[PDB]
Amino acid sequence: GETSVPPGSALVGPSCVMDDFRDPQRWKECAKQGKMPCYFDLIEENVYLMQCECTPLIACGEDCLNRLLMIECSSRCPNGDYCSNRRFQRKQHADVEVILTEKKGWGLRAAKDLPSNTFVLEYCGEVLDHKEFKARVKEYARNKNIHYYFMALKNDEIIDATQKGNCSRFMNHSCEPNCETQKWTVNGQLRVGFFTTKLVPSGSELTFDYQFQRYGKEAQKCFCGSANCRGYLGGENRVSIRA
Ligand SMILES: C[C@@H](O)C[NH2+][C@@H](CC[C@@H]([NH3+])C(=O)O)C[C@H]1O[C@@H](n2cnc3c(N)ncnc32)[C@H](O)[C@@H]1O
Ligand SMILES: [Zn+2]
Ligand SMILES: [Zn+2]
Ligand SMILES: [Zn+2]
């Protein structure tokens, strides 16, 4: 039939908002209604189980010798409080919103235009050794978990955001993504964050190459929708030249 502009609609029962992830009571209420994802423990930093030459005034922009090596400045930066290269320390995350997708579960979207190489969010979680990782892989497989939340930090340390993390756990995989991870040194400790790899317009889902599952043994249908989607996520090997 003939379509028309819908009337204004105001919700009766109040809206669930991003600040509600820092309000356990309201989040648990929202989750019962399917208005927010299943509760998890929101953490501010990972749980474990260098002076640039910038002139004091962008403060520590693209030419900063720390930034170029993916090292954050300290409080002793020549730019002091105005240093722009302390984004993980100051939790200077992008304006993001959590969305419910048709096929992949929840996801993250940009709420403003994000230029290329914008810091989105730190990927926080429990940092596991190989023994704890192997135990939890078996635990989650036995539990028939639908979603995975592991990401390698270093050759002997895997971050697990299944139980504890932040909204970066909702990032979905795309075969043609608009974000990547970068591993930065902050006060001598490696931390990992999501960064855009192109300009991402306001309203766009943020996506990345989920390497942990992509090169894992088992596979699942890929719902990314990309023009050149590889069809499934998982069961792939990186390029090699054999014999
Ligand atoms: C950032 C790191 O923690 C990984 N984040 C989860 C997001 C789960 C979130 N959606 C939810 O609802 O909590 C990855 C899982 O999401 C699924 N997912 C993603 N992108 C898919 C695709 N393109 N096709 C199918 N499933 C896909 C899959 O289960 C993956 O392990
Ligand atoms: Zn600098
Ligand atoms: Zn600085
Ligand atoms: Zn795909």
Q: Are 209 and 174 in contact (CB under 8 A)?
A: yes
Q: Residue 120 burial (CB < 10 Å; 0-12/13-18/19+)?
A: buried
Q: Are 31 and 38 in contact (CB under 8 A)?
A: yes
CA gap 174, 103 in Å, rounded: 13
Torsion of CA 80, 66, 195, 240, to 10 degrees: -170
Task: Provide the residues around ligand 2 (an ion) whose CB is within 5 A.
Answer: 52, 54, 60, 64
Strands 126-128 and 47-48: parallel
Binding-site residues for Zn(2+), please?
52, 54, 60, 64, 73, 77, 83, 175, 222, 224, 229
> CA Rg, the chain, in Å?
20
* Cβ atoms within 10 Å of 70's Cβ, excluding its own: 12
Residue whose CA is at the smallest distance from ligand 1 atom 15 = 147
Torsion of CA 124, 211, 150, 66, to 10 degrees: -30
CA gap 235, 166 in Å, rounded: 28
Name the nearest CA neighbour of 192 among 234, 220, 150: 150
- The widest CA-to-CA distance across the chain, in whole angstroms, is 67
Resolution in A: 1.5
Method by which the model was determined: X-ray
The one-letter amino acid code at 50 reads M
Q: Is 104 in the pocket of ligand 1 (CB under 6 A)?
A: yes
Instruction: Indicate if the alpha-carbon torsion angle 140, 141, 143, 147 is positive or negative.
Output: positive
Name the nearest CA neighbour of 206 among 116, 90, 72, 126: 116
Q: How far is the CA of 60 from the centre of ligand 1 (A)?
A: 35
CA gap 242, 186 in Å, rounded: 39
Best of 104, 170, 214 for a ligand 1 pocket test (most atoms within 8 Å of beta carbon):
104
